[PDB]
Design a protein around this nucleic acid. Structure first.
Ligand SMILES: *OP(=O)(O)OC[C@H]1O[C@@H](n2cnc3c(N)ncnc32)[C@H](O)[C@@H]1O
Ligand code: NA
Length: 634
DNA sequence: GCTGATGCGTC
DNA sequence: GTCGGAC
DNA sequence: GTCCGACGACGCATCAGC
């Protein structure tokens, strides 16, 4: 209706027609989306965020149904279905250059302000064409992603500058955040799905305008309304988990409604699905708690990458990553061995496996780092140098039957009976069915001796299905580095700090750490650190370290190719840091030359544990000790 | 034709 | 990937 | 328990600059 500047989607008793800031048939203004984002970031209760987004979506459904799909993508900061692999090719680098040119400022002034403010959007905002539309912005995002080849970056920057030129009010803030891949509203995929099912439930699509039914919940008690919306939410959520593709779902949702959705969109080979995830567990006793009276199995947790393998009726094979990226082209070796792993009675399947690097000469697992050296796309079978062994642990679909609602006890049995193991090519995950604490503890220890991270734990019959909408983190993961007093901890020196973002703007969000090389009496950067501290600890760090800020680095500190810290720090603080493994680093100088001529050592999954108030830098972990820790990984 | 910086996926 | 915090 | 924002190392693929 009126100026989108005053649009209030957090309004109590929000009316999808009377409270919209645009007219029926009008394109949804982008400022309407931005104002919704603003009202979402103002609150901390997710349910209030969902309500606010639901209000916007109800207006879109009632007034401008063609804009529902772009509005949803803008709210997710997605470009399209993940298996299509669309990429902006735009990060803070390209974006800050576009802002500098748009605002006519020096790139270094923009870069410094962005770091101080903790957000690129704030610089673009505080620094004539028609108003932007939601579908117009989304299409320009897609134009950026389709630009390739030489001189393509300059063309991307041209589009970004044109967007910023047309921005009003808060629009530039959220364009910049979206382009940088850091929307971070506090509302993401789960809340967007909750808002969508609520929106189409309360304001059914496909009504003749003006819609006779703008609030289908008004005739229900609060109790009945909540039960109804929860059921509708599960329909949408479970369908999406099986078909996480809005290009497919939304046209069906608009035409046939949410109740008929499962009839049109069903799990099928060749369409990636969401994978089942795992919740961390701190000890074997904790496991026995959450699985008190439910039989469960323990499996080795292999150190590779997830490979969801689809065999379609007719013989076509597709492979997808855990985030639904198409990996078919990177695994020609897997595609060729499918006839060898499945019995001839199998006509279609979806397998859940871990692809692990495998040394055929030595017949043993290789580290994850080796696996990542494989090529990623347009790979021909003859050129493969790092061989892969598949460790299969689940079966989601078989001979036309979805197993999503079947217990693991049955899925595992169909897996074990219809597929064939070959050493070093296709194996079932090593497993143990027991409830004895002593056998589990020995099994955990043996998993690490056999080159694995620890154990996966899964119920066999109680809440043991593959229904992600019911619970996405339905499995438990028990890694040895979760256990207190177990795993590698290091005492490292804080040599630099990185300015924080969003909530921590003006404070520190990360730090640069170093080990002490006795042979050269130098502090060598080993890794950055940005997790493990409580909010109180991170605030105290910002306080205690202010007295250490240096204008210039000490001459005995070496960081080589590490990211230069925003603030150098006088080497003094020593922190205890835990990691899962030590890796061979091309960038960090710590211990460079002690295990490899050109590469130093860094930490895998580093996290802060506590301050070592009783240690000075000269008693910190030495580069020689780092090298020793790396070697003992064998 | 090559190198290094950047982007974005893996874990 | 790990972690902490609001709900 | 759920969800989400904070942050980590690392590789290939790509393209700007040379
Ligand atoms: O730490 P995390 O949540 O990413 O762990 C889950 C991942 O672990 C991998 N994995 C390895 N071995 C298994 C088994 N046996 N079962 C399930 N997952 C397993 C997967 O890649 C998973 O995403
Ligand atoms: Na990243």
């Amino acid at each position: 209706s009126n100026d989108p500047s005053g649009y209030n989607p957090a309004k109590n008793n929000y009316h999808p027609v009377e409270d919209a800031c645009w007219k029926p048939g009008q394109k949804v203004p982008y400022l309407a989306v931005a104002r919704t984002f603003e009202k979402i970031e103002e609150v901390s209760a997710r349910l209030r965020m969902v309500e606010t987004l639901s209000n916007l979506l109800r207006s879109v459904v009632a007034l401008s149904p063609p804009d529902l799909l772009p509005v949803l993508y803008l709210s997710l900061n997605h470009l399209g279905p993940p298996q299509q692999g669309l990429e902006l090719g735009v990060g803070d680098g390209v974006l800050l250059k576009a802002v500098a040119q748009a605002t006519g400022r020096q790139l270094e002034s923009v870069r410094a302000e962005a770091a101080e403010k903790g957000d690129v959007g704030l610089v673009a905002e505080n620094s004539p064409p028609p108003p932007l539309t939601a579908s117009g912005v989304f299409s320009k995002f897609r134009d950026i992603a389709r630009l390739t080849g030489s001189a393509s970056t300059a063309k991307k920057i041209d589009i970004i500058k044109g967007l910023f030129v047309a921005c009003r009010h808060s629009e530039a803030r959220f364009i910049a955040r979206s382009l940088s891949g850091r929307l971070r509203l506090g509302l993401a995929e789960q809340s967007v799905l909750a808002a969508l099912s609520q929106a189409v439930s309360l304001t059914p699509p496909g009504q003749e305008f003006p819609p006779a039914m703008v609030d289908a919940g008004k005739g229900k008690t609060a109790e009945a309304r909540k039960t109804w919306l929860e059921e509708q939410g599960m329909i949408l959520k479970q369908t999406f988990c099986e078909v996480p593709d809005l290009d497919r779902i939304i046209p069906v949702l608009l035409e046939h409604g949410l109740e008929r959705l499962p009839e049109h969109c069903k799990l099928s080979p060749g369409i990636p699905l969401k994978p089942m995830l795992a919740h961390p567990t701190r000890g074997i006793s904790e496991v026995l708690k959450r699985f008190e009276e439910a039989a469960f199995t323990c499996e080795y947790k292999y150190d590779g990458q997830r490979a969801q393998i689809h065999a379609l009726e007719g013989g076509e094979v597709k492979i997808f990553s855990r985030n639904q990226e198409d990996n078919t082209g990177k695994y020609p070796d897997i595609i060729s061995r499918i006839p060898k792993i499945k019995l001839p009675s199998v006509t279609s399947f979806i397998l859940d496996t871990e692809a692990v690097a495998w040394d055929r000469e030595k017949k043993q697992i290789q580290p994850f780092q080796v696996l990542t050296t494989r090529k990623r796309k347009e790979v021909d079978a003859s050129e493969i140098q790092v061989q892969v062994c598949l460790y299969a642990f689940d079966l989601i679909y078989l001979n036309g039957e979805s197993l999503v609602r079947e217990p693991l006890s049955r899925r595992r049995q169909l897996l074990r009976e219809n597929f064939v193991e070959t050493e070093g090519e296709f194996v079932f995950a090593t497993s143990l069915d027991t409830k004895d604490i002593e056998q589990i503890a020995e099994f955990l220890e043996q998993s690490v001796k056999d080159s694995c991270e620890g154990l996966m734990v899964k119920t066999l019959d109680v809440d043991a299905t593959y229904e992600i909408a019911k619970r996405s983190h339905n499995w438990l993961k028990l890694k040895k580095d979760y256990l207190d007093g177990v795993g590698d901890t290091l005492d490292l020196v804080v040599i630099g700090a990185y300015l924080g973002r969003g909530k921590w703007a003006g404070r520190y969000g990360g730090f640069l750490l170093a080990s002490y090389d006795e042979d050269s009496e130098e502090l060598q950067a080993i890794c950055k650190l940005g997790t493990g501290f409580s909010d109180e600890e991170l605030e105290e760090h910002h306080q205690s370290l202010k007295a250490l800020v240096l204008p210039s680095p000490r001459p005995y500190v070496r960081i080589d190719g590490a990211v230069i810290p925003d603030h150098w720090l006088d080497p003094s603080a020593v922190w205890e840091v835990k990691c899962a493994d030590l890796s061979l680093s091309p960038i960090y100088p710590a211990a460079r030359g002690l295990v490899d001529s050109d590469k130093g050592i860094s930490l895998r999954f580093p996290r802060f544990i506590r301050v070592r108030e009783d240690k000075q830098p000269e008693q910190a972990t030495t580069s020689a000790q780092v090298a020793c820790l790396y070697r003992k990984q064998s």
